[PDB]
Amino acid sequence: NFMLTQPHSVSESPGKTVTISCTGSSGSIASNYVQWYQQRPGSAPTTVIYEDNQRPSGVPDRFSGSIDSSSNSASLTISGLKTEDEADYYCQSYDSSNVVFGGGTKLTVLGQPKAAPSVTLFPPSSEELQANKATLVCLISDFYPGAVTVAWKADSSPVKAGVETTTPSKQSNNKYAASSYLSLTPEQWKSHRSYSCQVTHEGSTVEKTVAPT
Amino acid sequence: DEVRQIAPGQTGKIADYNYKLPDDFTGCVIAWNSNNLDSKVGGNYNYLY
Amino acid sequence: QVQLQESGPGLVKPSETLSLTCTVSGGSVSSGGYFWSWIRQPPGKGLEWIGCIYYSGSTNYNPSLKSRVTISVDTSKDQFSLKLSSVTAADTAVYYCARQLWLRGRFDYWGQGTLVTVSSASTKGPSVFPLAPSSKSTSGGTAALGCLVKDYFPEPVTVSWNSGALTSGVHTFPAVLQSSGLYSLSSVVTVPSSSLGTQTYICNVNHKPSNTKVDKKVEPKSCD
Amino acid sequence: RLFRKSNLKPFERDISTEIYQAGSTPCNGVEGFNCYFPLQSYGFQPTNG
């Protein structure tokens, strides 16, 4: 029942000194070796310090750790924060034949330029209609800020059923992209005269329309 | 009025912020009056500090 | 030096045996007197220790994962494999195999993480419907076309345009859960309208979990 | 407020906007050296812990 308590989020400006803690509940922190791992997102974890004072060959000297056995806490001290230091930190223990890791420390990171919300529409294809299904796809791209509201329209009546939209995602050109999908039956697509997608972005509204042709 | 500040072992507002003079200063300082060329009517503010 | 790589399926249906094999390149399992371990990490969560093995039959497992971990070592093939029984939807984690120089201390080398996120056994292929551009689909001197990837399970799908020859203007969107279990996404590219009727655009949607590759040509809409 | 000359009496408000000698070098409203201000900004963020 031995667990390591670690602060979930730690924020500090680069160039300063910060302390990351790792507190053990039942067993004393000085009983077993404590190991810190610095793991980049989407990458394998890498040992950043071990033996509670020993730095591996390759890491900078700023990654220094200390042990406070009175408070049952393991402290890792970082001096002079940099850009590459923004990663997850986990503390390892062993207890008794059962390796126990830490909760994890997240480092807070730090605005894209504004852009016009280009909107495109396509009607459902004939191949999809032959499969007894219909889907209207609304796309929002090359825009900023990433706070857009989509509202499907059936001629004049708004549509909510079957509406699926995607959260904005950053593009390569420092802009954002979004999507919206409206699943419909083949009868409902041809029931109304026209279907339109309205995109609201910073007050301005860009509307495209399609019709069954 | 700031030509007296340029010496090894002085404290003020220009030497300590722009060009400090160390104790082992074997440099050699020459200056002259050039008001007829370095200044003009209407306010010559081309130089900064 | 030595390097560890993982293999096996990156997915497993619920309530079934999981099979992940991590092999060793540039080293020997038995020689050196070291240890092997499996460590998993859920997305957005901390690292979790599964178990450790020796090149002999010595095994120890986590109390939370006790009686569910079966790890074996075969020296002839120079690899070690772990078997997980009764997998659920909460076992979605990034599995790492790591060399252990010191059992109660630090690791030295971490293999690349073969993520396994799967919660159901739908295993449905990706429907690829063309997104025909038209006069109302263009705004100015440029037009847009694409393909719709709808009603597939599970993540992910890779979509490429003209076998990867077209990359400029290509936007891949993250999938969103539908009203009934499955996901949906699309991938589109912005093209000038002058080459709409003179250039052929084909989307290549690949779904490795369902072993389905679909190529769909994109053409301008024909009024009927 | 982070920097102060000395202790202050309880139930007293300090609104002195003056650059204190936090560092070694003298700093009593002058520019001096190592003069970090008693008044610093916060680090508030809604996405913290």
Residue C69's CB is within 10 A of a number of other CB atoms, namely 19
CA-nearest of C22, D1, D35, C37 to B16 is: D35
CA-nearest of A22, A1, A8 to A108 is: A8
Report helix, strand or coil for C89.
Answer: helix
Residue A3 in tokens? 């667990």
CA-nearest of A69, A68, A81, A2 to A38 is: A81
Residues 159-178 of A with CB under 8 A from C: 162, 164-167, 169, 171, 177-178
Question: Please, which residues have CB within 8 angstroms of residue C143's CB and are 6 or more apart in sequence?
Answer: C133, C137, C190, C191, C192, C193, C196
CB contacts, 8 Å: D31 with chain B: 13, 17
Rg (CA), chain B: 14
CA distance C112 to C133: 42
CA distance C18 to C86: 8
CA distance A76 to A71: 14
Residue C40 in tokens? 């998993």
Residue C214 in tokens? 């679909």
- The tally of CA atoms less than 13 A away on the side-chain side of residue B32 is 3
Q: Which amino acid is at C159?
A: V
CA distance A204 to C72: 62
DSSP state of B24: S
Residue A41 in tokens? 């997102």
Question: If you search the block for the tokens 């979990």, which residue do you land on?
Answer: C209
Contact D9, D44 (CB under 8 A): no
Give the resolution to one decimal, in Å.
Answer: 6.3
Residue D26 in tokens? 């003298």
* Interface touch A9/D48, C-beta < 8 Å: yes
CA distance A2 to A23: 10
CB contacts, 8 Å: A100 with chain C: 49
To which H or E segment does residue B37 belong?
helix B35-38
Distances (CA, A) of C104 to A32, A34, C52: 8, 9, 11
CB contacts, 8 Å: C102 with chain A: 33
Residue A77 in tokens? 């001290």
CA distance C78 to C140: 61
Is the N-terminal amide bond of C174 cis, ω within 30° of 0?
no
CA distance A180 to A138: 5
CA-nearest of C106, C109, C34, C112 to C73 is: C34
* Interface touch B13/D33, C-beta < 8 Å: no
Residue C14 in tokens? 């619920």
Q: Which amino acid is at C136?
A: K
Residue A159 in tokens? 């549509």
Handedness of CA B1, B2, B8, B11 (dihedral sign): positive
Method of determination is cryo-EM
Report helix, strand or coil for D24.
Answer: coil
Is the N-terminal amide bond of C126 cis, ω within 30° of 0?
no
CA-nearest of A142, A162, A140, A167 to A152 is: A162
Identify the chains in contact with C, defined as 3+ C-beta pairs within 8 A: A
